[PDB]
Write a protein that binds this ligand. Structure first.
Ligand code: PMJ
Ligand code: CA
Ligand code: CL
Length: 223
């Protein structure tokens, strides 16, 4: 997260860190046994870390739980990032409390202009690199579909929205991948892609979760 602020410990209780020896992606807890992340975060050897603030210090509210199953969206396209969404089942159910909580799935899609909360342990710099150990947060508006298309020379589908600041300076970044975009208490986005971070006219692109509620619910019900 570039140009954001320190969330505060466990203020984003649905935020998870995906760990394979080191933090490599964010994710969102949607019930006691299931995390939603980005398909581009796919790998084996994933341990899910809940209750985290400082990812380098055991602070006392963590739960570490191995993944038993990962399901990449049937139509994920790694060239375009279309359908960049993946579900992870936990080997055991997380113990839910004020610091480890699920986030509601949306009933309707969000609109352009809504300020949403984006969070993660990703790079905090637009040029060069610096990784925080505590969770970073950012409020960013959803941009109009037309504005997003005008600002990119890459494929944009109806399964994406863009959000952020066309003047640059504030955005998600590498390491925030798979993490939440929350708008009025609903999980509306997943950190997917963008050209650099926090660059002029290069806003962040996000998987549009409202298009996938059906798939998410059916998949969880049958697995
Ligand atoms: N087909 C398309 N759409 N091509 C354009 C995007 C490709 C790629 N962009 S990229 O290489 O600049 C991503 C990047 C890598 C290292 C350091 C900073 C940023 C990219 O984003 N790859 C996936 C990725 O790295 N996702 C992580 C991510 C998360 C947030 C942002 C952001 N600025 N909001 C960017 C990348
Ligand atoms: Ca910790
Ligand atoms: Cl571009």
């Amino acid at each position: 997260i570039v140009g954001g602020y320190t969330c505060g410990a466990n203020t984003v209780p649905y935020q998870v860190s995906l760990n394979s020896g080191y933090h490599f992606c964010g994710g969102s807890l949607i019930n006691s046994q299931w995390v939603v992340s980005a398909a581009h975060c796919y790998k084996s050897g994933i341990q899910v870390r809940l209750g985290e603030d400082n990812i380098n210090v055991v602070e006392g509210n963590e739960q570490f739980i191995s993944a038993s199953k990962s399901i990449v969206h049937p139509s994920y396209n790694s060239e375009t990032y279309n359908n960049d969404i993946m579900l992870i089942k936990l080997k055991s159910a997380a113990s839910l409390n004020s610091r480890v909580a699920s986030i509601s799935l949306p009933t309707s899609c969000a609109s352009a202009g809504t300020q949403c909360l984006i969070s993660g342990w990703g790079n905090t710099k637009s040029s060069g690199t610096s990784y925080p150990d505590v969770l970073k947060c950012l409020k960013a508006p959803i941009l109009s579909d037309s504005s997003c298309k005008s600002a990119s020379s890459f494929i944009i589908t109806s399964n994406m929205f863009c959000a952020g600041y066309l003047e640059g300076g504030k955005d998600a970044c590498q390491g925030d991948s798979g993490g939440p975009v929350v708008c009025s208490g609903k999980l509306q986005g997943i950190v997917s892609w963008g050209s650099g971070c926090a660059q002029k006219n290069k806003p962040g692109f996000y998987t549009k979760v409202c298009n996938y509620v059906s798939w998410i619910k059916q998949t969880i019900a049958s697995n």
